[PDB]
């Protein structure tokens with residue numbers, strides 16, 4: 001009771017939020033690329049320097065941000081993705097909290113440059129100070145947006161201590177991009193580190209062959225054991241691949257990617273169903289390898305559970321579990 | 334780009350935050366009791382009705398809230414617990430985000446009644462509407478505070494669907510209270526459900542015997558196999574009990590409570606160390622039973638990682654793991 005109850009200073013409030021959303025450089029990459037995706041980008045270029053502790057640049061050919069909404073793009077609780085509870089309960093976009101940019105801006109030097117198709121002029125914006133005041137200035141930029149995040153955690157010393165080696169931090173970025181590249185086969189993605197191109201994922205055209213990117217991302221070993229899945233029932237749909245348990249190695253088991261309505265996830269229920277189907281098919285149990293996609297009515301799933309959207313809750317839990325279990329078991333036979 | 338980037342309405346913004354902090358009735362109980370603890374309460378009475386979906390009342394004999402800070406107590410990002418980054422990096426209280434009450438108020442009918450020792454008058458406050466406007470009115474109340482949370486999720490229909498049976502929801506509350514009761518032996522805690530007293534934890538006096546409450550909470554079976562631990566090294570300290578692995582059953586293994594600086598936790602590293610020590614001691618591995626407390630310098634741990642403080646990150650990770658491993662292994666021999 002000694003200290004008065006007081007509203008937290010803008011920057012500090014955002015830094016507390018950043019602790020929950022921004023774990024490491026890879027987290028920044030995840031939030032910004034999901035923004036590019038929501039913006040309708042079909043090409044995304046990611047440039048990283050020193051594992052992301054020095055620089056993280058993401059350029060996309062999305063629709064861009066209007067000049068007079070740049071300050072709003074950096075403001076807390078400000079979003080163009082939802083505007084009501086109904087919008088929230090039926091999420092059709094990766095973002096919805098309106099917090100990512102504000103959180104990241106508070107623990108780094110973040111610059112936003114963008115131009116919409118209706119603008120002849122491009123603009124650049126950034127927030128500063130304890131009050132996070134925004135500056136908007138003239139810039140040169142094509143239709144689309146570029147995010148520049150420099151000196152991550154420069155103003156939050158303690159957090160910077162958790163940063164691993166640059167090789168390690170970059171590996172997590174590479175892994176994040178991997179997961180994203182598998183979520184959207186139709187998006188061209190380029191990734192570089194310290195001025196050197198490391199990844200070049202090419203968009204899979206209309207009804208094109210996805211096996212090409214699948215193998216390029218997960219590996220030929222996976223592609224060889226990959227069993228395509230096509231299971232549906234009403235609004236419930238299951239797609240993707242699952243390796244033959246009998247021919248799955250510890251290495252292949254490192255590939256356990258699942259998506260819910262296109263959003264990368266790591267759900268316990270989903271993993272259990274897949275594991276149960278493989279154990280019941282194979283003699284015993286042993287980490288399965290897979291890249292599965294679950295499509296479900298937005299109203300049947302709650303994605304407002306973790307600040308980084310790391311988890312979800314299914315209304316008809318038992319129904320969903322059984323659906324996936326049956327789907328995988330059906331392909332294994 | 335069709336919808337404008339717009340700041341979210343106060344209530345909706347809070348509801349999004351509530352989705353991340355308020356999972357179920359037990360979550361509400363957790364946040365409010367931690368508030369009572371931070372306020373210096375030595376006695377806390379918890380009354381629950383219909384699993385918490387109907388009512389959740391928490392009364393404490395803490396220091397209370399001053400009249401002119403009641404509105405602030407319900408406001409977003411407002412706290413008396415920290416006021417700077419230094420405060421954040423050295424957390425010495427359970428709360429620090431300044432969001433719990435605002436989040437809960439947005440998805441329920443929350444009433445706050447309180448009086449400080451310096452006040453002859455008591456006051457009651459609550460927020461309403463899309464803008465969460467606060468009303469403060471006269472009330473009768475002793476020194477301390479009472480929180481009343483009625484009709485949880487009445488205005489967020491979808492979320493209310495996830496509520497389980499009242500017996501189940503209450504069981505989670507009972508479990509939460511269990512974890513809290515073990516964190517603070519010096520606090521008297523009473524818990525009732527539908528007007529019927531269910532739990533009566535009595536405070537353990539100065540240097541009193543903690544075995545009494547330990548057995549009352551965890552059970553005589555645990556108490557019989559419980560091996561006291563006293564391991565220290567600098568600012569690092571390990572206290573509590575660990576059951577003999579050779580005499581631990583699946584039932585006893587349900588007791589895996591760990592605390593970090595008094596805060597209930599469920600850390601992977603901690604659990605691994607304890608499990609590693611037991612496996613290396615016993616012939617094979619098998620879920621250990623324990624109630625352990627880790628005391629560490631606030632600067633060596635990051636508790637600003639999850640909105641509900643469900644996780645932490647240790648700076649010198651390997652050091653901590655080894656400390657716990659050695660501590661437990663030392664007692665097992």
Ligand SMILES: Nc1ncnc2c1ncn2[C@@H]1O[C@H](COP(=O)(O)OP(=O)(O)NP(=O)(O)O)[C@@H](O)[C@H]1O
Nearest residue numbers: 035039064073079080095096097098099100101145
């Ligand atoms: N690359 C981009 N292209 C176009 N608009 C963007 C881009 N990045 C961000 N925005 C806009 O900026 C707003 C702010 O982004 P952000 O702070 O990430 O919040 P969000 O995406 O709405 N929700 P969240 O991620 O859940 O916090 C979005 O709602 C978009 O309208």
Ligand SMILES: Nc1ncnc2c1ncn2[C@@H]1O[C@H](COP(=O)(O)OP(=O)(O)NP(=O)(O)O)[C@@H](O)[C@H]1O
Nearest residue numbers: 368372397406412413428429430431432433434478
């Ligand atoms: N039972 C109580 N007795 C005295 N003060 C209280 C009590 N409950 C809440 N408060 C006060 O109300 C403020 C608001 O509470 P709350 O919204 O829970 O935020 P917090 O405890 O500061 N942080 P957080 O829990 O991390 O969101 C606290 O900072 C206290 O100053």
Ligand SMILES: [K+]
Nearest residue numbers: 073074075078
């Ligand atoms: K924003």
Ligand SMILES: [K+]
Nearest residue numbers: 406407408411
């Ligand atoms: K508050």
Ligand SMILES: [Mg+2]
Nearest residue numbers: 031035095100
């Ligand atoms: Mg976003």
Ligand SMILES: [Mg+2]
Nearest residue numbers: 364368428433
């Ligand atoms: Mg609190």
